[PDB]
Amino acid sequence: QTPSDFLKQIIGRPVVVKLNSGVDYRGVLACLDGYMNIALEQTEEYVNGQLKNKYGDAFIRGNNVLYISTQK
Amino acid sequence: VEEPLDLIRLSLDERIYVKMRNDRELRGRLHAYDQHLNMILGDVEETVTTIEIDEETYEEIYKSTKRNIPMLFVRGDGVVLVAPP
Amino acid sequence: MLFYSFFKSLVGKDVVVELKNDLSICGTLHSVDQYLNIKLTDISVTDPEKYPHMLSVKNCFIRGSVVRYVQLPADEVDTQLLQDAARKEALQQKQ
Amino acid sequence: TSALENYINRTVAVITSDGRMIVGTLKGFDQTINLILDESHERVFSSSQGVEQVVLGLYIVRGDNVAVIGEIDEETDSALDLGNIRAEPLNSVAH
Amino acid sequence: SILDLSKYIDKTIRVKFQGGREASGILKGFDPLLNLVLDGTIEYMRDPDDQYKLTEDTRQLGLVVCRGTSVVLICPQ
Amino acid sequence: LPLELVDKCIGSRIHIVMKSDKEIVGTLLGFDDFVNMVLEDVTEFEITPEGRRITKLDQILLNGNNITMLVPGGEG
Amino acid sequence: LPLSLLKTAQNHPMLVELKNGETYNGHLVSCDNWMNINLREVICTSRDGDKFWRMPECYIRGSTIKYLRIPDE
């Protein structure tokens, strides 16, 4: 229950999503699900500097997601 | 609650950009996918990115090759991310 | 279900399976199961036979987990079915 | 249906996910592709030392590590074709 | 199922884990899923240079839970 | 019982060590059945490089897939 | 058939190569339906032949098994 309530009150916030491969994605959390699949709008991608800036929604696999965090 | 899968099925019939494991990307028209992120893409272009290193200086030169195909099934375990081009 | 039913429609079609090991195999689709394991009849190694490790092999079972890509022709697929079935399926898995 | 039924007690070529070919005889399998095999030997070293080629008879391969099983056209027990050693060694399923 | 951990319930055990980690500690409790409670926990890592020299790569962690999902082997110490 | 220990660590500092040389120290807010953990104001360390990678603020959901060890009270 | 062979293989010598390239040499005392093992009288070895430790019982998670070499019997 603590995670499902977390899920509800991070919709619309800016977040950092880090994958298992160590890639970091930053942007506005458009959606998430119970399996930790993510869509983010305005997503930057980091590893060794700036690697991608994204102009539409990006969808991320929950099986490959290591963490999701609010950005402040 | 639109799930990420519900919002990615809004991009059906459209051209998408898929970044895959092994320094590879695909661009193609999204005909189908499931919850595992298995995907059927039509009119696709695969790009394979590799690092060539100068033997003497250790300086890296980025090189690429490309493959194109009419219709292609992609296993979902190779997919890292989906976006548009 | 979706891709299991999709590969059941392509039995008896000529397809190319490219693996995670970079090996590419031409062959005729004979059967598929619930994990999307493929059995291919009358196989030949495509790209080059630089992978000669088979040669004397005419039919292979492929574990579904080692597939990277399955290349198909455009003539084999109804794209309307695939988009309609996909919209119905993502709606089914999560509800 | 795609079962490994047709390949029972016949010569087979197995590719493990490490990138290792095996010649063997498939005695048994289950529904996770856990392979029970006999009379196993490699393929990359038979041209150097044919005695060292024979690893064993009798081993359990776990289905998680199996990539590929291929059916080979054995005349009768005690015979198979081909050998190789100057090929770009095959890779693993990990990338 | 197969291993009753009640025979190991209070002694130092050696546990290898999936990511390459080795941990050693006194078993204080467990569940059917093989989650463990260990006391006096030492964690060891493995590098290419640390093989028989496994002692320099040592961290102390005190009381821990080891997740039963990544447990790869368990034996006495 | 291990899950009872993790329940006892709600609202305490905890250190979460992954399979890799990576670990996460923060206050444990709660967890689910699969041990996906919600952590608040989290410090992310890589052990191998000898340095923190980020100071997180707010809450993180840290997936239980790669979680090897849970240390109540944190480091030392 | 395979897990059935392991159930009847209770008491045999066995060599177990794991995912991590470590070798276990012991005598099988029990298996389950998920292929986890316990084994009696055990040698731990790296792939390169380094013997690190010796034990009387050991439990091996079935997911970490690469393969099991049984006797020719």
UniProtKB/Swiss-Prot annotation, chain B:
Coiled coil start-end: none
Keywords: Acetylation, mRNA processing, mRNA splicing, Nucleus, Ribonucleoprotein, RNA-binding, Spliceosome
Subcellular location, record wording: Nucleus
Domain spans labelled Sm: 3-85
Domain of life assignment: Eukaryota
UniProt keyword Cell membrane present: no
One GO process term, biological-process aspect: mRNA splicing, via spliceosome
Principal location class: nucleus
Molecular-function GO terms, alphabetical: RNA binding; U6 snRNA 3'-end binding
GO cellular component: catalytic step 2 spliceosome; cytosol; Lsm1-7-Pat1 complex; Lsm2-8 complex; nucleoplasm; nucleus; P-body; precatalytic spliceosome
Subunit structure: Component of the precatalytic spliceosome (spliceosome B complex). Component of the U4/U6-U5 tri-snRNP complex, a building block of the precatalytic spliceosome (spliceosome B complex). The U4/U6-U5 tri-snRNP complex is composed of the U4, U6 and U5 snRNAs and at least PRPF3, PRPF4, PRPF6, PRPF8, PRPF31, SNRNP200, TXNL4A, SNRNP40, SNRPB, SNRPD1, SNRPD2, SNRPD3, SNRPE, SNRPF, SNRPG, DDX23, CD2BP2, PPIH, SNU13, EFTUD2, SART1 and USP39, plus LSM2, LSM3, LSM4, LSM5, LSM6, LSM7 and LSM8.
Family according to the record: Belongs to the snRNP Sm proteins family.
Purpose: Plays a role in pre-mRNA splicing as component of the U4/U6-U5 tri-snRNP complex that is involved in spliceosome assembly, and as component of the precatalytic spliceosome (spliceosome B complex). The heptameric LSM2-8 complex binds specifically to the 3'-terminal U-tract of U6 snRNA.
Protein name: U6 snRNA-associated Sm-like protein LSm3
Organism ancestry: Eukaryota, Metazoa, Chordata, Craniata, Vertebrata
Gene designation per UniProt: LSM3
Curated annotation (Swiss-Prot), chain D:
N-acetylthreonine PTM positions: T1
Source superkingdom: Eukaryota
A matching Pfam family: LSM
UniProt-annotated location(s): Nucleus
Similarity-based family: Belongs to the snRNP Sm proteins family.
Protein task: Plays a role in pre-mRNA splicing as component of the U4/U6-U5 tri-snRNP complex that is involved in spliceosome assembly, and as component of the precatalytic spliceosome (spliceosome B complex). The heptameric LSM2-8 complex binds specifically to the 3'-terminal U-tract of U6 snRNA.
This protein's name: U6 snRNA-associated Sm-like protein LSm8
Source organism: Homo sapiens (Human)
Organism taxonomic ancestry: Eukaryota, Metazoa, Chordata, Craniata, Vertebrata
Swiss-Prot record, chain E:
GO CC terms of this entry: catalytic step 2 spliceosome; cytosol; Lsm1-7-Pat1 complex; Lsm2-8 complex; nucleoplasm; nucleus; spliceosomal tri-snRNP complex; U12-type spliceosomal complex
GO molecular function (one): U6 snRNA binding
Domain of life the protein comes from: Eukaryota
Location in the cell: Nucleus
Main location: nucleus
Keyword annotations: Acetylation, mRNA processing, mRNA splicing, Nucleus, Ribonucleoprotein, RNA-binding, Spliceosome
Domain called Sm: residue spans: 1-77
A GO biological-process term: mRNA splicing, via spliceosome
Membership in a protein family: Belongs to the snRNP Sm proteins family.
SUBUNIT field: Component of the precatalytic spliceosome (spliceosome B complex). Component of the U4/U6-U5 tri-snRNP complex, a building block of the precatalytic spliceosome (spliceosome B complex). The U4/U6-U5 tri-snRNP complex is composed of the U4, U6 and U5 snRNAs and at least PRPF3, PRPF4, PRPF6, PRPF8, PRPF31, SNRNP200, TXNL4A, SNRNP40, SNRPB, SNRPD1, SNRPD2, SNRPD3, SNRPE, SNRPF, SNRPG, DDX23, CD2BP2, PPIH, SNU13, EFTUD2, SART1 and USP39, plus LSM2, LSM3, LSM4, LSM5, LSM6, LSM7 and LSM8.
This protein's name: U6 snRNA-associated Sm-like protein LSm7
Species, as recorded: Homo sapiens (Human)
Whole-protein residues included: 11 to 87 of 103
UniProtKB/Swiss-Prot annotation, chain G:
KW Acetylation (keyword) present: yes
Residue span(s) of domain Sm: 1-73
Subcellular location field: Nucleus
Entry's Gene Ontology cellular component terms: cytosol; Lsm2-8 complex; membrane; nucleoplasm; nucleus; P-body; protein-containing complex; spliceosomal tri-snRNP complex
Keywords in alphabetical order: Acetylation, Isopeptide bond, mRNA processing, mRNA splicing, Nucleus, Ribonucleoprotein, RNA-binding, Spliceosome, Ubl conjugation
Main localization category: nucleus
Biological process terms in GO annotation: mRNA splicing, via spliceosome; nuclear-transcribed mRNA catabolic process; P-body assembly; RNA splicing; spliceosomal snRNP assembly
Signal peptide limits: none
GO MF: PH domain binding; RNA binding; U6 snRNA binding
KW GTP-binding (keyword) present: no
Subunit organization: Component of the precatalytic spliceosome (spliceosome B complex). Component of the U4/U6-U5 tri-snRNP complex, a building block of the precatalytic spliceosome (spliceosome B complex). The U4/U6-U5 tri-snRNP complex is composed of the U4, U6 and U5 snRNAs and at least PRPF3, PRPF4, PRPF6, PRPF8, PRPF31, SNRNP200, TXNL4A, SNRNP40, SNRPB, SNRPD1, SNRPD2, SNRPD3, SNRPE, SNRPF, SNRPG, DDX23, CD2BP2, PPIH, SNU13, EFTUD2, SART1 and USP39, plus LSM2, LSM3, LSM4, LSM5, LSM6, LSM7 and LSM8.
Described purpose of this protein according to its UniProt entry: Plays a role in pre-mRNA splicing as component of the U4/U6-U5 tri-snRNP complex that is involved in spliceosome assembly, and as component of the precatalytic spliceosome (spliceosome B complex). The heptameric LSM2-8 complex binds specifically to the 3'-terminal U-tract of U6 snRNA.
Gene that specifies this protein: LSM4
